[PDB]
């Protein structure tokens, strides 16, 4: 009840910054998450015993794949923590509660394969969920873990508060399907520019939380250059394993997944920064000005990838 979580001084100061890296000590990541819930939500948001049992069941349902692993989950939750702390007064109590949980859970039981590969392999999940295949699965695993005994961290919510939070989590997790992001950002672009954007409009909130989810999910491109660069290796380790599997099904993978195109990686990063990341943090900075450090960090990593192409590293 009178029990704070406290971090060492360097972590206590740097965790508040968007570019924070959670570090290589896996055993500290639960405490980092709890620290973030307590400061973002309060020490009274969740029964600590239920929260710790929930964090450990979530951790246990992430697989040991190179990128879509427990470290990604906690990293995406830390970006979300940084957005919520820099926009204190824009978000309900339920949203604060829901969005950190959504981020921790958003890739539950990922196998390191795209929706596209599941559909080509004809995986049972691709017959159960025609679109956003992995993302409906991730929300489904979230509800399972929540329904385990001693795991209902939302036990103290009213019936209707409970349903609102699960609905915030569902839409947040669906929104992490990057196929949906392009249309969502386009609409947000238009609404902000015509000045129709209205945060009391619930369907507008939804779009804005959706874009926050994309921003947190892509936050590897907003870290210090050495973190960004080494995460790219984990990212391609997954994509190229998928490319191998595509070739096994008798299909030429897209170039992004073909390890035979290792050489073109620097140029694949530019496309990705120009086509996805920059537009994402731009529209986010317009809508939520204190998130500008994500845009600035993304542009610095783009300029680092341009240096790589010019042979300056
Ligand atoms: C479109 N494209 N084409 C290639 N190629 C390589 C040579 C041939 C083409 N690479 C790509 C981009 C893939 C990518 N990079 C990143 C970095 C960070 C992140 C995340 F953490 F933000 F999510 C996601 N991705 N996704
Ligand atoms: Mg995902
Ligand atoms: Zn993710």
UniProtKB/Swiss-Prot annotation:
Domain PDEase: 1-312
Protein's GO biological process: cAMP catabolic process; cAMP-mediated signaling; cGMP catabolic process; negative regulation of cGMP-mediated signaling; regulation of adenylate cyclase-activating G protein-coupled receptor signaling pathway; regulation of cAMP/PKA signal transduction
Tissue expression from the record: Abundant in the putamen and caudate nucleus regions of brain and testis, moderately expressed in the thyroid gland, pituitary gland, thalamus and cerebellum.
Residues at which 3',5'-cyclic AMP binds: 68, 269
Effect ascribed to mutating residue 107 to N: Reduces activity 1000-fold
Protein's cellular compartments: Cytoplasm, Cytosol
Any one of the GO CC terms: cytosol
Keywords, in A-Z order: Allosteric enzyme, cAMP, cAMP-binding, cGMP, cGMP-binding, Cytoplasm, Disease variant, Hydrolase, Metal-binding, Nucleotide-binding, Phosphoprotein, Repeat
Reported impact of residue 107 to A: Loss of activity and of zinc binding
Keyword RNA-binding: no
Active-site residue numbers: 68 (proton donor)
Residues the record lists as binding a divalent metal cation 2: 107
Binding site for 3',5'-cyclic GMP: 68, 269
Residues annotated to bind a divalent metal cation 1: 72, 106-107, 217
Domain of life: Eukaryota
A GO molecular function held by the record: cGMP binding
Keyword hit for Magnesium: no
Entry comment, domain topic: The tandem GAF domains bind cAMP, and regulate enzyme activity. The binding of cAMP stimulates enzyme activity.
Quaternary structure (record): Homodimer.
Similarity comment: family membership: Belongs to the cyclic nucleotide phosphodiesterase family.
Disease: Dyskinesia, limb and orofacial, infantile-onset: An autosomal recessive, early-onset hyperkinetic movement disorder characterized by axial hypotonia, dyskinesia of the limbs and trunk, orofacial dyskinesia, drooling, and dysarthria. The severity of the hyperkinesis is variable. Striatal degeneration, autosomal dominant 2: An autosomal dominant disorder characterized by striatal degeneration and dysfunction of basal ganglia, resulting in hyperkinesis.
Task of the protein: Plays a role in signal transduction by regulating the intracellular concentration of cyclic nucleotides. Can hydrolyze both cAMP and cGMP, but has higher affinity for cAMP and is more efficient with cAMP as substrate. May play a critical role in regulating cAMP and cGMP levels in the striatum, a region of the brain that contributes to the control of movement and cognition.
Protein name per the record: cAMP and cAMP-inhibited cGMP 3',5'-cyclic phosphodiesterase 10A
Naturally occurring in which organism (per UniProt): Homo sapiens
Parent sequence residues shown: 724 to 1036 of 1055
């Amino acid at each position: 009840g009178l029990m704070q979580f406290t971090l060492p001084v360097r972590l206590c100061k740097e965790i508040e910054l968007f570019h924070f890296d959670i570090g290589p000590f896996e055993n500290m990541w639960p405490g980092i998450f709890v620290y973030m819930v307590h400061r973002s939500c309060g020490t009274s948001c969740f029964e600590l015993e239920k929260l710790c049992r929930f964090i450990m069941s979530v951790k246990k349902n992430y697989r040991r794949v190179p990128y879509h692993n427990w470290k990604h989950a906690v990293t995406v939750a830390h970006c979300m923590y940084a957005i919520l702390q820099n926009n204190h007064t824009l978000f309900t109590d339920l949203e604060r509660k829901g969005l950190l949980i959504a981020c921790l859970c958003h890739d539950l039981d990922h196998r390191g394969f795209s929706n596209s590969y599941l559909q080509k392999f004809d995986h049972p999940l691709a017959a159960l969920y025609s679109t956003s295949t992995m993302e409906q699965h991730h929300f489904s695993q979230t509800v399972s873990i929540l329904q385990l005994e001693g795991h209902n961290i939302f036990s103290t919510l009213s019936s209707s508060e409970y349903e609102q939070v699960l609905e915030i989590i569902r839409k947040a997790i669906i929104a992490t399907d990057l196929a949906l992001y392009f249309g969502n950002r386009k609409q947000l672009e238009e609404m902000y520019q015509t000045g129709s954007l209205n945060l009391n409009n619930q369907s507008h909130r939804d779009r804005v939380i959706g874009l926050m989810m994309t921003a947190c999910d892509l936050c590897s491109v907003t870290k210090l250059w050495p973190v960004t660069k080494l995460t790219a290796n984990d990212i391609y380790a997954e994509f190229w394993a998928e490319g191998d599997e595509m070739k096994k099904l008798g299909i030429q993978p897209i170039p992004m997944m073909d390890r035979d195109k290792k050489d073109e990686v620097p140029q694949g990063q530019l496309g990705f920064y120009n086509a996805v990341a920059i537009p994402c943090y731009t529209t986010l900075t317009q809508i939520l000005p204190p998130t500008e450090p994500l845009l600035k960090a993304c542009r610095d990593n783009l300029s680092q990838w341009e240096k790589v192409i010019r042979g300056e590293e």
